[PDB]
Design a protein around this ligand. Structure first.
Ligand SMILES: CC(=O)O[C@H]1CC(C)(C)C(=C=C/C(C)=C/C=C/C=C/C=C(C)/C=C2C=C(/C=C/[C@@]34O[C@]3(C)C[C@@H](O)CC4(C)C)C(=O)O/2)[C@](C)(O)C1
Ligand SMILES: CC(=O)O[C@H]1CC(C)(C)C(=C=C/C(C)=C/C=C/C=C/C=C(C)/C=C2C=C(/C=C/[C@@]34O[C@]3(C)C[C@@H](O)CC4(C)C)C(=O)O/2)[C@](C)(O)C1
Ligand SMILES: CC(=O)O[C@H]1CC(C)(C)C(=C=C/C(C)=C/C=C/C=C/C=C(C)/C=C2C=C(/C=C/[C@@]34O[C@]3(C)C[C@@H](O)CC4(C)C)C(=O)O/2)[C@](C)(O)C1
Ligand SMILES: CC(=O)O[C@H]1CC(C)(C)C(=C=C/C(C)=C/C=C/C=C/C=C(C)/C=C2C=C(/C=C/[C@@]34O[C@]3(C)C[C@@H](O)CC4(C)C)C(=O)O/2)[C@](C)(O)C1
Ligand SMILES: CC(=O)O[C@H]1CC(C)(C)C(=C=C/C(C)=C/C=C/C=C/C=C(C)/C=C2C=C(/C=C/[C@@]34O[C@]3(C)C[C@@H](O)CC4(C)C)C(=O)O/2)[C@](C)(O)C1
Ligand SMILES: CC(=O)O[C@H]1CC(C)(C)C(=C=C/C(C)=C/C=C/C=C/C=C(C)/C=C2C=C(/C=C/[C@@]34O[C@]3(C)C[C@@H](O)CC4(C)C)C(=O)O/2)[C@](C)(O)C1
Ligand SMILES: CC(=O)O[C@H]1CC(C)(C)C(=C=C/C(C)=C/C=C/C=C/C=C(C)/C=C2C=C(/C=C/[C@@]34O[C@]3(C)C[C@@H](O)CC4(C)C)C(=O)O/2)[C@](C)(O)C1
Ligand SMILES: CC(=O)O[C@H]1CC(C)(C)C(=C=C/C(C)=C/C=C/C=C/C=C(C)/C=C2C=C(/C=C/[C@@]34O[C@]3(C)C[C@@H](O)CC4(C)C)C(=O)O/2)[C@](C)(O)C1
Ligand SMILES: CC(=O)O[C@H]1CC(C)(C)C(=C=C/C(C)=C/C=C/C=C/C=C(C)/C=C2C=C(/C=C/[C@@]34O[C@]3(C)C[C@@H](O)CC4(C)C)C(=O)O/2)[C@](C)(O)C1
Ligand SMILES: CC(=O)O[C@H]1CC(C)(C)C(=C=C/C(C)=C/C=C/C=C/C=C(C)/C=C2C=C(/C=C/[C@@]34O[C@]3(C)C[C@@H](O)CC4(C)C)C(=O)O/2)[C@](C)(O)C1
Ligand SMILES: CC(=O)O[C@H]1CC(C)(C)C(=C=C/C(C)=C/C=C/C=C/C=C(C)/C=C2C=C(/C=C/[C@@]34O[C@]3(C)C[C@@H](O)CC4(C)C)C(=O)O/2)[C@](C)(O)C1
Ligand SMILES: CC(=O)O[C@H]1CC(C)(C)C(=C=C/C(C)=C/C=C/C=C/C=C(C)/C=C2C=C(/C=C/[C@@]34O[C@]3(C)C[C@@H](O)CC4(C)C)C(=O)O/2)[C@](C)(O)C1
Ligand SMILES: CC(=O)O[C@H]1CC(C)(C)C(=C=C/C(C)=C/C=C/C=C/C=C(C)/C=C2C=C(/C=C/[C@@]34O[C@]3(C)C[C@@H](O)CC4(C)C)C(=O)O/2)[C@](C)(O)C1
Lengths: 312, 312, 312
């Protein structure tokens, strides 16, 4: 199609740059400058709004393209194959075209507000400058083709079930675990400390299982879950804690996402995460909160997941 | 006997409740409400007084019953068999009957002072309420049978060597290690942080080795060691640290306990604990004290254990 | 030779003491009293000056003697064989005789300033006192033989290369990593916290690989690298951080040391260190600094090592 043809031209312009980027650099776990959690949350919110508006089948296809790209990584910089680079870019271009321009620009603007002005020059300094310049000229041509195809209005929101078994169970989980939620330091930098002993390629294989799960999940359930997180961001207090009602709606929506893929897909995520998560990480997190509230939350989670399991 | 027959009736009333308690919940590592270390120490002291007064052969038998019960645990909640539930309850009833009523009530009163009033309702909320009520009615009938057999005066105290090789060596250990003892934060919540990567059932198998060791140990030596801890609690300062003299008496008494079982029984404890203790736990503890005082204490310990080893 | 013959007499006098010392005690990782980092750095500086003045072939031979001695360790206290004790003492005596008396006395004076006056008595208390006294009388006789052979003036400095590929690359590494260097707490006691789960004998086998590497490295390159550290100490600020220029000269000098042994010698060090370094140690260090500056330093290091690798 037009975007796919344009992605091939973009690859001609940009794959030399892609091969030189060191994708295994740990810097990409960090914020693009000083960490500003609530300012960053505004940018994530714009992304969540955009993802909720995007065509669910095109989001699926873009996830699938990234899964395939992970399988073709080679060499010391972690670069995917030329064909997969193009396949990812085409799929993302189709996603971009499925939402109105203002939603895309809102992401750009909100990310630019948290990005240190010196970040582009530092990134470019690690690669061949002419190749980066050629890649960017390629991007500018590509986005013109994307815009030609781009919708001018956003699709409406998802339907939200009420009183289903997961929703009822989520109320109980949320009441039991909100004290724990309120204890957690949502503004900490700890979430960007690296996983001890885990290479980027090993992390990527765990992320892959979540990408695969996303591609399998029900698109309407995913959309509704994104919408619930947008609501929740809007209701935070000064410490970043969402309201109790919005938390419960997040838990219900995520339970419905879990139940929209088979057990094996979810266990693949869990098992891959278990392989990369040092056992001191849960201990460190637990140690920062009230231990009674954490055990109350965990007991409630293990009860809730039985309701999800039955629905799944 | 009368208590054993009553324990069978108690089991008819209470085993349904036992099967539904989630014995693998980590909450039981935590204080029953907000941690109040010096108030809890008062409760532990009442337990120590009671244990020192109890019949050593009945304490032994109760330890043995728990060892046997650990072997029959099954199912997702960690419940022991019906037969072993009864065997534990009978053995504990005999222990209770071997001390005067006031010592038992002193434990109840001192634990009640640290227990949040909402704890019973939270526990009951996790199980079938009718079964918990039936279990408690069973307990009330059982305690009447126990009371009929209960002594009215406490048995006398233990015999204690003075100037034996272990006692002399304990003086040296204690002088070398009291600076370390004083450094430790006895009022911290860290001792209730869980063992990373270790399930409740794995921890239980390590605890089993200590229960086995207690069942083998000399009852008079155990009694004397309990009495030494009661005295040591009496002399604590405002930070919880006992006097140097009472510390030395504890070390001597514990050395005599160690030497009252064979080497293999003690090494079974050590090896099981090594299997559940993350190597960062000793480091974390060491990092909170003066490193010279910790090495002085450790060197003194490894000297002391040679005297214990020879006596053993 | 005269020093070797005298080392045999020293061994007759001191090996009984050596067998008694508990060389596996962790206390030797710690400062000899309260840690005083900048005062200790003055003593290290005197050792660096002395090492830079010492005969490089005799330093090599003394490193080799320690490598051999590690291989003959036996028994619970970690003592090397009698023959290797003598071989080490003779080799060290020859090193001492290769520098002027004032450089040796300067080390003694600067270490004595950081050593708590009670340290000698505590060490002696752990061994047979008569054997320690016999060993010290032996040392006093030995040092008289060493002095008879001792030079009266210091050998000259090393040649400092300029503009070689390693030096040019070190400029770039140093510019990129100086922000990280400035963040590190150089005055912390953390560097003397022990390695979790690693015995002294396991640590010793990792140190052995560095001793072997030192014995193989170019003596002039080692000398120049010592001299660069002496200069860097001279330019420290109140937090202990050397100047940017002296840091760059250290990096250049160390790169030349690395490139003066084959890759396999360096990888033997790395692999042995990987076997004794808990993966939480890099995380703990990373967590104390700016994560962007640490990743900038690391990316620059992995670029720099490619230049070293080509030269090597
Ligand atoms: C249902 C559900 O769960 O959905 C989930 C789905 C996902 C996908 C997983 C997900 C996500 C992530 C999302 C949405 C990411 C969105 C990314 C958007 C990127 C936008 C970009 C780069 C935009 C721009 C705009 C630019 C403009 C450049 C110029 O105008 C400038 C300034 C000046 C002009 O003179 C010239 C110009 C050159 C024209 C530019 O250069 O770039 C999320 C949040 O998890 C939700
Ligand atoms: C650790 C490791 O190894 O990770 C490996 C992981 C993988 C996945 C295997 C891998 C890979 C591939 C990767 C990451 C590819 C990333 C591609 C990103 C593509 C982004 C695109 C196209 C984004 C946009 C945004 C657009 C915006 C367009 C507009 O806003 C613009 C401007 C101006 C408006 O006026 C009009 C507009 C139209 C609204 C657009 O048109 O396009 C790799 C490299 O191997 C690394
Ligand atoms: C199209 C598109 O946009 O896709 C995007 C969609 C998203 C959603 C935005 C997105 C994402 C994120 C995704 C998918 C996240 C997935 C999360 C999965 C979580 C799974 C969990 C917690 C699983 C488990 C399993 C457990 C098991 C526990 C037990 O068995 C254990 C051990 C032992 C038993 O004795 C008891 C037991 C208790 C039974 C547990 O405790 O937990 C992504 C990547 O961006 C792609
Ligand atoms: C910086 C900042 O301020 O950020 C703010 C951002 C927000 C969004 C506003 C905000 C918030 C709210 C947040 C994060 C809420 C998070 C909720 C997470 C819910 C996750 C759920 C339910 C996941 C699961 C996984 C499940 C797995 C189930 C199974 O695998 C299990 C086990 C075992 C299998 O055998 C069977 C199975 C069924 C397969 C399940 O059943 O459920 C907050 C707090 O305000 C912070
Ligand atoms: C570009 C940029 O800046 O992006 C920014 C974007 C954001 C969104 C703003 C952002 C953010 C915030 C994020 C991701 C927050 C994530 C928070 C996660 C918190 C996780 C917690 C608490 C986990 C746990 C696990 C626990 C386990 C407890 C137990 O298992 C334990 C031990 C032992 C068992 O016996 C009992 C048990 C009870 C079961 C616990 O107790 O707690 C950030 C970082 O600012 C970056
Ligand atoms: C030598 C040596 O080392 O010994 C070691 C031995 C051990 C065993 C290992 C050891 C230990 C632990 C010990 C001793 C534990 C002791 C536990 C005691 C439990 C006591 C209980 C539950 C008592 C009560 C009392 C109750 C009263 C209820 C009522 O009166 C109430 C209010 C009102 C009435 O109207 C109705 C009523 C219903 C009548 C009740 O309901 O319960 C230790 C410390 O390590 C020392
Ligand atoms: C992680 C995991 O799996 O752990 C597993 C570990 C095990 C061991 C295998 C296991 C098990 C079994 C367990 C824990 C059993 C516990 C039993 C407790 C019994 C307690 C008893 C009888 C206590 C008392 C107290 C009494 C007090 C009586 C009086 O004070 C009363 C009232 C009133 C006074 O006026 C008169 C009095 C007479 C003075 C009494 O008469 O009796 C299980 C379940 O499998 C879990
Ligand atoms: C009837 C009744 O009431 O029973 C109750 C009685 C109690 C007492 C109240 C009770 C309890 C608690 C109990 C039993 C506690 C037991 C504690 C045991 C501690 C044992 C220790 C530290 C053992 C070791 C072994 C070590 C070995 C070290 C070395 O070998 C190593 C690696 C390598 C060699 O090269 C050098 C070495 C240096 C030689 C060491 O360093 O330490 C309980 C459970 O309540 C039951
Ligand atoms: C909250 C609060 O305030 O609490 C307060 C409570 C108190 C009680 C008042 C208090 C206090 C004092 C305390 C805790 C003192 C603790 C003393 C512990 C002593 C433990 C000893 C000796 C244990 C052992 C184990 C041994 C093992 C020996 C062997 O295995 C070894 C190695 C190797 C084998 O080959 C041979 C072997 C021979 C088998 C041994 O020889 O000895 C304090 C500080 O005031 C705090
Ligand atoms: C190029 C390269 O790689 O260099 C590296 C090489 C190394 C070797 C690895 C290295 C190193 C370490 C170095 C140099 C260590 C130096 C050690 C020196 C020790 C000196 C000693 C014990 C000196 C003395 C002096 C004493 C004097 C005693 C008396 O006078 C006193 C007071 C009073 C008189 O009345 C009696 C007396 C009895 C006469 C004594 O008793 O002891 C370094 C730094 O890494 C650099
Ligand atoms: C964990 C573990 O197991 O580690 C194992 C590691 C090994 C390596 C295997 C091992 C071993 C052996 C070891 C450590 C041996 C150490 C030997 C040290 C020797 C030091 C010597 C000779 C130092 C000096 C200093 C001198 C100074 C002389 C003068 O200044 C003096 C006074 C006075 C001036 O007026 C004149 C002077 C002339 C200037 C001198 O003449 O001599 C062991 C024991 O097995 C432990
Ligand atoms: C004669 C005399 O005086 O001798 C004395 C001389 C001295 C010098 C004073 C002395 C000393 C100290 C010495 C020798 C120190 C030696 C330091 C060596 C440092 C080596 C380092 C960091 C090596 C590496 C290797 C790495 C590998 C990384 C990778 O491969 C990895 C994993 C995976 C790939 O995919 C990518 C990769 C990135 C390629 C790395 O990242 O780092 C001593 C002991 O006193 C003796
Ligand atoms: C207390 C106090 O204040 O102390 C003050 C003390 C000072 C000295 C004044 C001071 C300072 C400065 C300091 C410490 C500087 C430290 C510099 C360290 C440089 C280390 C280097 C370059 C090491 C290496 C190792 C390399 C390995 C390369 C390879 O193995 C690699 C990877 C992979 C293989 O396949 C190939 C290979 C080629 C084999 C390499 O290429 O390089 C400061 C900060 O002021 C503090």
């Amino acid at each position: 199609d037009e975007i796919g043809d344009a992605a091939k031209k973009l690859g001609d312009a940009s794959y030399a740059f892609a091969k030189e980027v060191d994708w295994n650099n740990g810097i990409f776990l960090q914020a693009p400058g000083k960490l500003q959690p609530l300012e960053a949350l505004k940018a994530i919110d714009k992304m969540i709004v955009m993802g909720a508006a995007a065509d669910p089948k095109l989001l699926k296809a873009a996830a699938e393209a990234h899964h395939k790209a992970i399988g073709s990584v080679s060499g010391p910089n972690g670069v995917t194959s030329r064909a997969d680079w193009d396949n990812v870019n085409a799929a993302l271009g189709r996603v971009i075209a499925s939402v109105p321009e203002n939603m895309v620009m809102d992401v750009y603007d909100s990310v630019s507000k948290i990005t240190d002005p010196k970040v582009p020059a530092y990134m470019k300094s690690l690669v061949n400058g002419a190749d980066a310049e050629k890649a960017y000229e390629g991007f500018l041509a590509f986005k013109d083709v994307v815009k030609k195809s781009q919708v001018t209005s956003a699709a409406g929101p998802a339907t939200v079930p009420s009183g289903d078994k997961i929703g009822v169970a989520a109320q109980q989980l949320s009441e039991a675990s909100y004290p724990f939620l309120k204890e957690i330091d949502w503004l900490s930098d700890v979430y960007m400390k690296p996983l001890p002993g885990v290479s980027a390629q090993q992390s990527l294989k765990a992320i892959d299982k979540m990408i695969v799960m996303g591609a399998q999940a029900d698109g309407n359930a995913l959309k509704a879950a994104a919408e619930a997180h947008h609501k929740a961001i809007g209701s935070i207090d000064a410490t970043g804690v969402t309201s109790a009602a919005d938390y419960a709606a997040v838990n219900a929506a995520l339970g419905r996402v879990i139940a929209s893929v088979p057990k094996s897909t979810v266990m693949d995520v869990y098992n891959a995460m278990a392989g990369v998560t040092d056992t001191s990480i849960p201990l460190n997190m637990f140690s920062k909160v009230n231990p009674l509230d954490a055990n109350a939350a965990a007991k409630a989670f293990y009860t809730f997941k039985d309701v999800v399991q039955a629905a799944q």
